[PDB]
């Protein structure tokens, strides 16, 4: 179990760690988060009390270094940093733990939610979508745009999700126009899986990371990417059985975790009705369809 200490908390802020969250008051004696489960990526995220504009946060993996948070009064945000001095870091954490100034990652033992949401998410892949090679962790916020959004404006601050576009030469083989548009299997299996992602695990990892950025930061381009990656699978007549089985589990836990009150803005009616009721895979998503019908029957 690992720890992300905080130097201090000089501004009132709501702090998220994965699907959990807590409020810290201005100058409250908060010095970090302990008992963070090893084996998963994590995200630590922020919404200031005085300007809820810009949710922002950091994806990290404690196996890759010792990380801490420190408020920067010039740039006005909580920044993640790496401490290279290991003895210094251990001595800081141990002091803060002895003074009980840390919150404990509050994982229920029965609860596999975070695993289920991050099953295929790897830090090395996050760092290719979010390019800032001098850090081992990745910053994301509400306003960052995607490469695809930029094409339709600062490239260093972009989310480099794989571009998916159903009316594009990449998606449509000359001479198979109708076939490829109405059945996207060649785009899914040859172009994307064999070609770009190399395997379904990497495809699912990007799909899961896109959802998590949509949910935690309200990142609109991430929401677009998540829906595009669902629609590309559902609109393919030929999908390996393991991917259909895995997609149902992935989406079930995403829909389960989504705040009920954010459904209006995080769920695309057209995509979901098409995927669940019209597409080739309309009868291949039983768990996703059952939770969607019981939790969001309005949308459908």
């Amino acid at each position: 179990m690992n720890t992300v200490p905080f130097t201090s908390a000089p501004i009132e802020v709501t702090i998220g760690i994965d699907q959990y969250s807590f409020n810290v008051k201005e100058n409250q004696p908060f010095h970090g988060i302990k008992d963070i489960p090893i084996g998963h990526v994590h995200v630590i995220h922020f919404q200031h009390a005085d300007n809820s504009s810009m949710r922002y946060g950091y994806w990290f993996d404690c196996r890759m270094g010792n990380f801490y948070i420190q408020y920067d009064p010039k740039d006005g945000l909580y920044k993640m940093m790496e401490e290279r001095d290991g003895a210094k870091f251990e001595n800081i954490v141990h002091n803060f733990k002895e003074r009980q100034m840390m919150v404990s990652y509050p994982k229920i033992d029965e609860d596999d939610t975070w695993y289920n949401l991050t099953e295929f998410v790897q830090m090395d892949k996050i760092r290719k979508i979010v390019r800032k090679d001098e850090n081992q962790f990745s910053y994301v916020d509400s306003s960052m745009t995607t490469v695809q959004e930029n094409e339709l404006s600062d490239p260093a601050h972009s989310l480099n999700y794989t571009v998916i576009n159903f009316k594009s030469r990449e998606a449509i083989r000359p001479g198979h126009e109708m076939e490829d548009f109405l059945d996207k299997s060649y785009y899914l299996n040859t172009v994307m899986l064999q070609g770009i992602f190399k395997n379904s695990s990497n495809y699912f990892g990007e799909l899961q990371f896109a959802f998590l950025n949509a949910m935690f930061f309200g990142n609109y381009g991430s929401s677009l990417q998540w829906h595009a990656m669902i629609e590309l699978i559902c609109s393919s007549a030929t999908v390996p059985k393991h991917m259909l089985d895995k997609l149902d589990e992935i989406l079930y836990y995403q829909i389960k975790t989504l705040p009920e009150q954010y459904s209006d803005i995080l769920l695309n009616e057209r995509v979901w009705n098409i995927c669940l009721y019209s597409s080739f895979q309309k009868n291949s998503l039983h768990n996703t369809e059952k939770i969607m019908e019981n939790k969001y029957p309005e949308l459908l």
Partner: protein, 237 residues
Amino acid sequence: GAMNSSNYAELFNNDIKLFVDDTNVYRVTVHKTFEGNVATKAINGCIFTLNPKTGHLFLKIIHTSVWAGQKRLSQLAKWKTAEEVSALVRSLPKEEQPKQIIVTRKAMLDPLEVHMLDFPNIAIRPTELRLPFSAAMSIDKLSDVVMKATEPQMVLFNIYDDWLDRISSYTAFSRLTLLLRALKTNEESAKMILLSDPTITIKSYHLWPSFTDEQWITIESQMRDLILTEYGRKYNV
């Protein structure tokens, strides 16, 4: 975006454009089977691709053999239309290729867009105009070449005959749409109006009769009367 009454003169400017109408691509007769079931029999069809400025009509005849062994024909017909329009564009010299293609039905947008991916600078547009191009098969010479076809064929016509020698392309299109609207509302009466006078003939190289300017004014009024007559007979007014 969409083409409507606000941007109507755009049809007659010097940017090459084509209307594409797919109404008459997939045509059937519906008939009973020997067991009392219902079955369709296809008949030859056509794509109606028209330059509204010049009158040039690219009539691609769709022979019934293209449907043999195919499923979901009404959906296929849209993709076949887009394939053939794309093939026509590729066949034209660069300086003759359209800068816009306007489809008369919104269901042609995605098929045509997909087939024209290689032409990103050709705009594919819908229209809010309700154009009567389905009635093209009420023009005897067009219907004749479609029904006689024994294989796929493209035939080129000028749907304005020689009218542009005397009137503008705005006025020519208005005349065409009025004639076609009349033929669509009451084909029998419209054709009666157009031929009632045996001394006015259709030239071998034309589609419509050789009316003088004054006779066209009479004809056009008779067509407007017909359309209002039918509108009353329909709605009881």
